[PDB]
Design a protein around this ligand. Structure first.
Ligand SMILES: C[n+]1cn([C@@H]2O[C@H](COP(=O)(O)OP(=O)(O)OP(=O)(O)O)[C@@H](O)[C@H]2O)c2nc(N)[nH]c(=O)c21
Ligand SMILES: C[n+]1cn([C@@H]2O[C@H](COP(=O)(O)OP(=O)(O)OP(=O)(O)O)[C@@H](O)[C@H]2O)c2nc(N)[nH]c(=O)c21
Lengths: 328, 325
């Protein structure tokens, strides 16, 4: 399967080989064809796009060196990440390099005044679900990496400050005697948080389990999810979280889909699970309510019902719910 | 599927509900039935076990409060993690992991005499029992997080251990990590994709090796999942990046935790759409197509090459392709 769920599609080729090519990156930074994306507090600069009278779609305000040349003069006040090179199979190494630039919110509102037509897409939820399919992944990659730099400014091993390197996909500790510099450790590389999201099916196969936290919007039920524990497997993390939150024992756990979640860095691992019990014992400390919903109740929601609703189609939870109805 | 690959099996129930129950943990710390595992520089204390004339099996030297009571008096010099409760007053066999100074460890090793520390992690950790493996995988992974994430990456200040050793809080009041729920506070899990690339004709498979790899050993191609990247697309990426082979369909096959220090192997069986190999040399020293006969020879008793042990996921995906043929 070729991952399709929102954030799975990109307009770029990561080209990680060009990351340790300082001579190349430096040349592409000043190149005119090079595309730049502006970010303020992990929020991308987007304009509104060629439409005639109809509802206009949100597109990323694609900057060039001409605009961004001024901001680059303060490398201590900015964060530049090389995203990759554009895809163009149809029709100097002619590659459209793409970069991501993080700036101060003091200098950002200054830029927003000059832009006038371009604006920052905030809050990340649900605003980030508006972008184009291929633009989504580019933002998912950008936001995730920038979020790592914004919150991992220091070395967790010794506490000393860190230097950005390898085009923004590495961080080196400046304390010479630090043990992080002796070998290869995760402290230097960017974080990816694995999350399991599961569609639990009743032992009779006619119902499915859905729940909600306190923060969740009123009357909205979704698939149960949780972070994979260290030294734990994908399948056993599914069996754990369902029993922990709802008190429902799980049997077979089948992997179904992939969905990146740039909040800030997370990877949703969608699973279709078969439950072996029927009683629900809600934790209240992890989930406010959990219930068994019949296939008719769900079919009503996925079409146009109802006393409850599920997440949008651009959220993996919705796709696993859709999967069970088709698989029935 | 119920994950079977080495490190997938545990003797415990994690019981994360009991983590924020400080009153309960304190009572179980002094309880006699409670099991303790000693660790020195992420290496567990193991004894040897019974069998006569043949290879003796490696087992964990299961300590009790009677032994460990002295070490607990210095909480600044130790790291205690609540693992979980054994699967079989709330009659539950609590299990803990204790990290100690190598100065105080060699002092204990002298008293133990029969128990010894299982070092180096590779390949020594592959010797343990199936169910003991996962317990070590869980323990080593968490202890390794505490040993290298002693400070807050957001502001640089020191951090406090909490929630039975599954959380770390920054002590700087104005720190933004204390403002909301962030990954800086929780333990790390590094996702890795390991893929079995099948030749477009299905009779061959792609295997490669780095410079560090033991001489003449070829394995499945693997790599870390990039931020904002999917499991399937990370497979299609790494294969083309290392070997220059274009990948088609990517099918998930198996789960395998890798406590080196924290990693989760996501085994996939992928179909190649190209045949030419263009080795990177900066990531892989050599890559080749191996026929099913060449592979069958290795998995039995050949050969000019060999694959990883059966307790490594790479070996299981290789076995999977032979069965699936
Ligand atoms: C990076 N990060 C962010 N959070 C936030 O803290 C909240 C606590 O709630 P939660 O951790 O139970 O969320 P869940 O595990 O279902 O994952 P998600 O729905 O895919 O996000 C989460 O819902 C996130 O908004 C996180 N929460 C936890 N527990 N662990 C993390 O690593 C983490
Ligand atoms: C936690 N960590 C440890 N390493 C070590 O650095 C080496 C660099 O080599 P590698 O990163 O290419 O290993 P691979 O991606 O094939 O993953 P593995 O075979 O499952 O480990 C790895 O082989 C590890 O020994 C790591 N290497 C990288 N790149 N990133 C990490 O997060 C990381």
């Amino acid at each position: 399967e070729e991952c399709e769920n929102y954030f799975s599609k990109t307009l770029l080729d990561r080209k990680s080989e060009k990351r340790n090519n300082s001579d190349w990156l430096l040349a592409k930074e000043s190149h005119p064809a090079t595309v730049f994306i502006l970010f303020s507090d992990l929020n991308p600069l987007v304009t509104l796009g060629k439409e005639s009278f109809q509802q206009p779609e949100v597109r990323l305000c694609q900057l060039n060196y001409t605009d961004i040349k001024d901001y680059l003069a303060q490398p201590e006040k900015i964060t530049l990440i090389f995203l990759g090179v554009e895809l163009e199979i149809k029709d100097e190494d002619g590659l459209v390099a793409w970069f991501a630039l993080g700036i101060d919110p003091i200098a950002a509102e200054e830029f927003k005044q000059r832009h006038e037509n371009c604006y920052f897409l905030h809050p990340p939820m649900p605003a980030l679900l508006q972008l184009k399919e291929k633009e989504a992944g580019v933002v998912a990659q950008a936001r995730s990496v920038l979020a790592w730099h914004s919150r991992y400014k220091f070395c967790p091993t010794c506490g000393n400050a860190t230097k950005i390197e390898e085009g923004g996909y590495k961080r080196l500790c400046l304390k010479e005697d630090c043990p992080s510099l002796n070998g290869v450790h995760n402290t230097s590389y960017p974080r990816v948080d694995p999350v399991v999201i599961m569609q639990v099916i009743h032992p009779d196969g006619t119902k499915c389990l859905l729940g909600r936290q306190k923060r969740f919007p009123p009357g909205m039920f979704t698939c149960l999810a949780g972070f994979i524990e260290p030294g734990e497997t994908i399948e056993d993390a599914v069996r754990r979280e369902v029993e922990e939150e709802s008190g429902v024992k799980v049997g077979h756990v089948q992997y179904v889909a992939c969905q990146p979640w740039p909040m800030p860095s997370s990877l949703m691992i969608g699973c279709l699970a078969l439950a072996v019990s029927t009683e629900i014992k809600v934790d209240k400390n992890e989930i406010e309510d959990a219930r068994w919903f019949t296939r008719e109740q769900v079919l009503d929601v996925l079409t146009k019902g109802q006393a409850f609703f599920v997440p949008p189609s651009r959220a993996i939870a919705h796709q696993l719910i859709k999967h069970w109805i088709r698989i029935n």
